[model samples]
Target: GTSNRDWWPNQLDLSILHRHSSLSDPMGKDFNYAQAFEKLDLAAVKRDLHALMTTSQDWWPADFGHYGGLFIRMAWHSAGTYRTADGRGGAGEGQQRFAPLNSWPDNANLDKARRLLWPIKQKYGRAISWADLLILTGNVALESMGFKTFGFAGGRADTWEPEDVYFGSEKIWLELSGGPNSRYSGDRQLENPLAAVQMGLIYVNPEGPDGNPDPVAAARDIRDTFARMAMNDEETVALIAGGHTFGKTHGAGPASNVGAEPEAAGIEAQGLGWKSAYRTGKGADAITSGLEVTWTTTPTQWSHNFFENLFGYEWELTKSPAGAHQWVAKGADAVIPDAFDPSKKHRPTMLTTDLSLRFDPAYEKISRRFHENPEQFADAFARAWFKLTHRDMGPRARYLGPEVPAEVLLWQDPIPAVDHPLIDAADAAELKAKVLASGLTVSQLVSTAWAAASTFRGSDKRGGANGARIRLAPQKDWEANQPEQLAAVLETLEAIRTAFNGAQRGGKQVSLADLIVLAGCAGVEQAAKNAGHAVTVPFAPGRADASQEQTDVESMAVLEPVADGFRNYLKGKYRVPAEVLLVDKAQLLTLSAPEMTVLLGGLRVLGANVGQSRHGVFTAREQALTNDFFVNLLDMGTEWKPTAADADVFEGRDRATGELKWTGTRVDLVFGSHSQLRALAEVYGSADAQEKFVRDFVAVWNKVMNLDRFDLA
Candidate 1:
């Protein structure tokens, strides 16, 4: 009994379960069996199977060869256990036990074969297992090919892994010695018959001096092994041999001698004995000499009569040296003697014999035995052929049980032959609307919109200082350095103006938001530049009084021209806002060297007068006030230079006060303004009186403004 007798529950309602499954669901309990079965035509399945098999045979490494041989072997092995004594017979339930079938050397190479059928089993639910499917398919293949019936059932469950290697120490050998017992030890070869068959199936000639064995050697070895395992069953041999009727063999190398060099051997040795069996004279003789000749009565009909001749002595004769030689020579007998001579050829036929010897009673008896029991022959042949060819033809086969329904098999609907109806209707409507609206297409509007969007988003960020550090001017000395400070301020202002102008010209859609950001960046940059410039400005050593200008002529004289330029440019550019004039005076006053130096420089720049001692132009009070206004407007700093001449004149000091004066020249008599001298004494006090002099001067300036005018000329 099978170990998994309770694998599928009998009470499980298949019909109810199938209601929720797809059409392809084979195990759907509620499935409409009629509809489903009708959809799956056996003819189509057979066609696909044929194509797969034929393709696999032609494409040496194709999956068909692997699956086909394995499946056939599986079925043969399953049925091999059949007997009238065992109630189970050859039906599918035979090979369900992994410990028995899986442990058999003949079923060893079934790991991949079992796994490959997983998807099919999954789709069909648990109706059948891979072990059962493989074996059943092999039986079907035999039946389809006009062979005997093979028993099949559906309850075999797949094993999780291969069984332990229990068929120990019994290696199967292909090539043998002179006698039966002379064969090489099984240990030197393969203990597993399935592996042995695989080896033979893809046989390549060896690289020794004798060269490689032919592919037929592998096929024959497998068949012999199966026959031996089946107790020398001839019927089994004949049925399995039928498979070779449709297959052909070819050399393994580009040139016959390049790799395996099989062609150098006799036809039998080269594995081309099938062709030789029918074409040789001995093969023809076998047909005439009471061998079961299936080819036409006429020997010339050999091509079309080959299948019929397979069960005849022709097969035996072709295995002979003379017959194979004649076959290789295309039935021309001249090559026969050369076939047996190894020196004349690279390989000699191993089993060549005359037609009389090949068709002797023994050969005829075996052939007759196979013909009488084709089912047994097929089983035995399937086992042996597959074993020899390294193919599986038993439990690994994939079988189709019954025809599936058309609706279930073909779920996809046929595609419509017309254009998309909705798309066509929409296009027609669009055309009508366009004709009614202007003579333009909506495509034109789409193009316009796209262009607008592209232009708007195409803007890019541009210039600043391009990341270069800002350069600031260095200051020198107090009064002179003032110009440097002012230059720094102007430079910063100009930079800000440039940044604003750039924002405008660069087409930066200048909005309040953008402008604010730009202003903040520019302000920071300006402040940094100013701070850098201030740190380098030169400062005077000490503070000085206003009267110290006469001590340094250089500083005092230098300021004259600079002051004049400022006054002229300012008067022309802006209203003075006050009556102003440059004062003329000759006075000597004390001054510090540095202050005098700065004063002279200022005087020269301003075009102010410079004398031998304490000389430099001064500004009237109003002029001074106006100067301050101009400076503020221009954002300039005040000058630190002093005028020596203005200081001396203001102090009532005269040039003749000491040795510098001439004889008969009073200190204030010669230099004083003659009219002012007479008027000052009459109006206020003597020239010697400082307070009275200041009062008189102030009165003169006040009277002029009171009259609403003042004249420098």
Candidate 2:
């Protein structure tokens, strides 16, 4: 009886009710209580019936008048006691508590409804009676409607419980046939009158040997039942129909008498209720006229007048103008012939009679016949009722599935990598050099560099970094366009390459001293330029102006002493040091390209030493420069050196060891008159170009030493 997470007992109750209503009565007689109960497993039947009657009503109390009909219908079905044609037993004996019948379509609300009755069943145990249980719960609906609760008994036995009712149960039968008792008689064939009568009470046909009855025949049978029931005794019909005074409305269906044939005129005259009838003045005049014309009429009261007018006109018109005959003839033809006679009072204003009122045998039979027959009425009513009530049940039940311990149903299965090479070595190198040489502001350079490097491929395409490439591109009319910027990067790369090429062309041999000095110069120059410093060359001979002195003797002398000390240190450290001290012109011109490169690299670090101006360059100066002299002494040598005599100048060690510590021996090479002109020319020449040349010269020098595998450091 416990609620399943997948479906609330209320939802199941409604579903079962819908399924039940859609089925033919298994009793093959009327939609009896036993037949209804027989449609579901015993426990399920009891549970559903109880839940529908009690718990289901709690869902919409404000709409109780609407929701209560199903509750009452289910109860009546559970109480009517009509059994299978075999007479196994009636609903009172709980014969439906057995296998097939217990799970029959006539009793969809059984299991779900019994959930609400579980407490009662548990409380009374075997002492609870089915009749009392059914009737008492039914009366409870009136209580929910603010009506009286009729006293009732309770002592039903739970002895007829069934097992495994899901297969070939009442549900299967109901699904196969329209209900429990109807059979398919072909399209347009007349439905069996008994089945049609039952249909009038429920909505669908019941399960039986034959499948489902024809809808048209069901309609015809219901029309006849409605006419007979209403005409047989007007007062009871009137009172029950008058219950619409509470402003009740009926739903549309096959058993919906308002739209059906025989009762169509009567149902139209009824209007919807006091509101719809009064609002449209549909049946108002008929109420008055029936009071004046019929014996069972009370014009002012809400009850008898309705039936008198509703049935009187329907019956009277069937005999007059031949239209009335059409209504009766239509029923016979299984068509519910349309009525057009205005004088005969037309059909009731609303054929869609309230289901609660239809439960009363008189009104039920009236609507039953008017629609077709009991089975047809039951089938239509059940279908329409189930639909109206459980429209929201499917989704709600799905939502509750996880909460309940029910099997979860799913409708589909879960949603696999696809690689590309984006950058090659050449591209990476180009990008690196471009970033290096870009002279734009930091932001501009970063933007440009990002653009050049950012390439997206396949899954690697991340948008943010790729966008930086666009931002890095030069703006229109901008001084630093992307191409020009990239060109500058290429220039730097070419310079380094040129330096390397120059060294390779030169002889492989280069002094370690020259290599160290050149490497130091290149490192410093690169560091300075990287820091954004403006640079210039200080000592290029061809660019020198006339009358300029050749060099600064005083500065040369100061640096010269340090150069000596350095040389001595090298000699003491490596054993074989440079033999010549001054670079001669002949040696400079004769040196190999590689040796020249190494010499240039060393001289740059030592600072330039220009001996004389152009006019002072004598024949002696040109001849003294041997390739050995230039390569070993000038280009590859240190500027600072110490004399053996100067070793005493330092305070630290024994004379022999102290001799290695000589200091302050530097003397100017061009002290007297040549210093002024040389200083002026060195300062005036393009310093930036000269510094770059020095750095270039150093790069070449290191290439030679590196080739030679010397550890200058």
Candidate 3:
């Protein structure tokens, strides 16, 4: 009943489906599954992805929360349940759909995520793995909100059939060491205790209900549970804090695994949704908060506000009538401005672990950094999520890597430019209509177009502009902005302008600066194409460009002395003892850490002019936009040498490049060396993260390059 297991007719050996090969179904219907697999319709995948990212169920109040948060929890909980020794449920098996695992206490209310994804699952069928679908849905959900995440690999498949129940149900557990009063072993053959066999089940236990939840015990449980799936301290904090951003808890509960106390054991949630169900001021119920509310101001999208909220002093712990403990904002902390109705401040809420994290100094530090910069938080949480969801209790090396050289990857190909015949009339019409509706106006579009096409400033060998739009205006007598990169793009911009005229958007008289922005886009498009790289360079049109006179020279001065992490930039530039990079230099550029990585990746691949020597990572490839630049930076081949010039300043050299010439900006060195920042660098370095690398870049690039324009808004 789970699904139509009547997959392959004629007694087909489903095992024949080569997971690694182009053909997916190794069956009697072999040819059909194989040929279909070879030409997998990603269009279908993308279509569903858009729906998940855009719409929400109306059953919940609009302000209650975005369902994307629930989708995230579902994926995390489903995937988090796996343990190598147990070899039971995991995202690999999609076993969460049935009994036991599905009904676990940790997974409470997450059933909603399953209900929401049911349609996507049916539409894709066995073709796409349930594990991959769950992960991808959450990935898109966050990325759509401007959060960064990795790309997909096709090898994952569904393991929902046979062996009597599900693939995971084959094991009958010895619940509580069999006896006359035994609540132990069931149908399947079982055994006794192994390693640190704790008393309660790990299922509903990691969180709390254990008498107000002991902080030390709860923390230990979290660390131990996460470690089973290969997560460390930094990852644990990021996952818990970042994951809590979207969803809230309900007071009702059909408490899944609370033992000993009869009332706390199985109180039904009244079928509304899972939550604590104890009566007010009674026993464990004294510590519960029955309220369902958003954690951050921008709960609809992923942000670092979860950690930010924790840092605020407004919270105080309390037990709810439902038998759960959580933090509630005291005094004015509960107040919030109504976006829907602006006079009130937002309510305060927290999970038990949210407070526990603060109790530990080490954990709080990581949480603090995430609170300080969201980009860094998004990047760190993404890696943990990716790793957690992909755990199949199988051989990890098969999914992870045996790290090597540069990898080439990109997902979004450019939507054909104005003059290309590939541009469908209908799509073009729709795009134009959307363009009219989009925030981009002619003047602002032109401003961005200049940078989009050629944002670089050549101070010596460095032709720089990684969405530091100020580069388009700031320079020594406007000298840095001139480059062949500029010339190449101008011609294309003129063509696009001419094309615009033929369309209904004709003869609109855009500024010269506006034309420059388009020219820059054209240059980048051509730059990517010539390199055999297909990319989605951010696009938005309709902005007026400011002349050098109109642009504020003083404002642009702040972003000077461009940060370079590669050799492509030389004076050529000079190496300095400045440790400014330690502070997240791109902060002024308004680009997130991930955004900075992607733009620099492009610059490195396409041969940016200025460079790094401060213990930075450089690539061997030319014009391949990738996340690998960061990957390589954090690679084993990278060597850092502290320069005598200053205390925090250091020079980075990659022996793999064979070029000992050093020119990296000191700031670029921070990403690889700093503990707080290195997790992001590691993400870019991981398996097949290029799709995510480019996607976030395009999104952030458009935002940053147009930061100064009205059209951008």
Candidate 4:
């Protein structure tokens, strides 16, 4: 029980990179899902899925004798956890199959939805992933209920539950309002990277902000949380209305009668949780979300009645049978068919968040437009639903299925295809020479290339050097990239590109994208040569340049680094240690622990720290690809103490004379401080491992440069 994390909480979490290793995966590394999927009878899978949609089970019966509403909620919640700030949560990996998410308060009763799909998953096996099945089932549900969908993609592979996604700092479940554990700050502004208004809820409290039944406040919370998920006002309204079109919330009895979450439940319950103590909990007595309401007459079918009822009725604030806040439509307008019994009709109702679409000025306008135009509402909902599901899948290149959409949305960060012939080995050598002859230093070249390529996050497969976006707006101006230095590097590289193209007699032309990577390769080679290790850095030349028009300035702005440990860059004071941020960035890059360690050590000696700060630059020989950073870092002769002015800054002094040998930030000292990282530092710092260090550095460098190489993938 006394693990490294439990023993030393402040130690940089390296487990994020190690999670779901080959040992955890039964498919093994050689498993080719794409080829297997191609062999799959997709039509047969859909046919089976369509059949499963209505076949209700005895243990957990489907509402209205159809599992459409349940499956839709399952898929929606799976993807709806996505927030644009970090691109962590989504349907990309089948994370909903694991802890926290599976047990979250808002995700109640979704366990049954997944259990329902177990048959399909078991039947498909290696040919499909749970991530893809979740979304596809949602699509089939919509279609079964008379709704047309935009499209579906199927490349999402099931991954083991991620151990590093930061939901929030809260220790308790569903803490809201002015609680000490709340994620809000001044003026109720939700914290960064966390989209949910509460700890366990997907987006916001369904009743209201802090459980207050005010539509105006609820609308604000909705807009803020939905915006974090990259949804605009129109998209937000469309999702809420569209999602409510098929389902009815469950609150047949008080929520106090519900059992523990899946993770905490007794073994007798099997894998299921939230077992209700109320009468016949399987059928008419579910208590999910602590609210009960049917939004439309046709609860099992897709229709425009959600909006019709919203605009048509006069709603009065009320409580569900669970004593949770909700609204019931007045008088005759409240009549809606019961989900369980054909002999009865019940009052149509809405949650506080739902009423916000009617009360908020901007939301009301969009809601009215949708209410009047069913076609427009359908289109907006379809497109928005697609984005919600596929937002984290990165570019269209990664998508694999017959239903893959042809229309390239701006959010995909579409890049122009390489129309011209790429440079060969000889051309690359000549270009590298030209780049080296340019006035930019090894530090400048290496840093610029790192800036361009390091933008790639494996989470969403966004950013990276493939687009050469470091030369465009937003990224070109980011503080972490050092705008002035980036501009200077880009200027010189652009000139080299122009001269190379001008000298070309044939169709073969070198792009600035390839040249930028080439410049980095040249710099790395030179640095290796300076350290007496001759090595060649691999370079790929098919990367295409994206123009300013193709780039979404607002979207790209989110990818800007708040801190990068490799570059020893920190943009602002953070709640966590700088080294933790380093690990986070490494996780985003999909780097191994040794790879991250070697990269940090190599970059420090390469003078790659932002704004030319000497912190973490332990080596006197800057721009030399040696292990001096690790060597000096692991030296027992040196004693470290925090500087008086800044706790984050440390001074490394000689043990005998107390002379300040070097200064470093927490990022540098972490290598010597942590047991795991120190072990890695000791290996590279060993005298016999110089060649190994340089080779490893080269491999990781090449890996970063090609991280966005979906073409190669």
lDDT of each: 0.27, 0.28, 0.47, 0.88
Candidate 4 accuracy as TM-score: 0.98
On the 0 to 100 scale, the lDDT of residue 237 in model 2 is: 34
lDDT digits (tens) for residues 657-706 of candidate 2: 33321122111211111233223223322334444444544344333223
Off by over 4 Å in 4: 1-4
| Candidate 3: stretches off by over 4 Å | 1-38, 58-65, 162-209, 252-293, 335-345, 393-713
**Residues 94-168 of candidate 1: C-alpha lDDT, one tens digit per residue:** 332344443332333332334444444455444445554555466445554444433332333333432222222
Between candidates 2 and 4, the one scoring higher on lDDT is 4
The superposed Cα distance between candidate 2 and the true structure at residue 50, in angstroms, equals 14
**Best to worst by lDDT, what's the order?**
4, 3, 2, 1
Instruction: Give the CA lDDT, 0 to 100, for residue 71 in model 3.
Output: 70
The TM-score-based order of candidates, best leading, equals 4, 3, 1, 2
Looking at candidate 2, what is the lDDT of residue 687?
34
What TM-score does prediction 2 earn? 0.23
Which consecutive 10 residues in model 2 have the weakest lDDT in total? 409-418
As for model 4, its CA RMSD to the true structure in angstroms is: 1.4
How does candidate 1 score on lDDT? Answer: 0.27
Q: After superposition, how far is residue 241 of candidate 4 from its true place, in Å?
A: 0.6
Each candidate structure's TM-score, on Cα atoms with residue i matched to residue i, is 0.26, 0.23, 0.43, 0.98
- Number of the top candidate by TM-score? 4
Score residue 283 of candidate 2 by CA lDDT: 23
Clashes of each: 92, 165, 68, 0
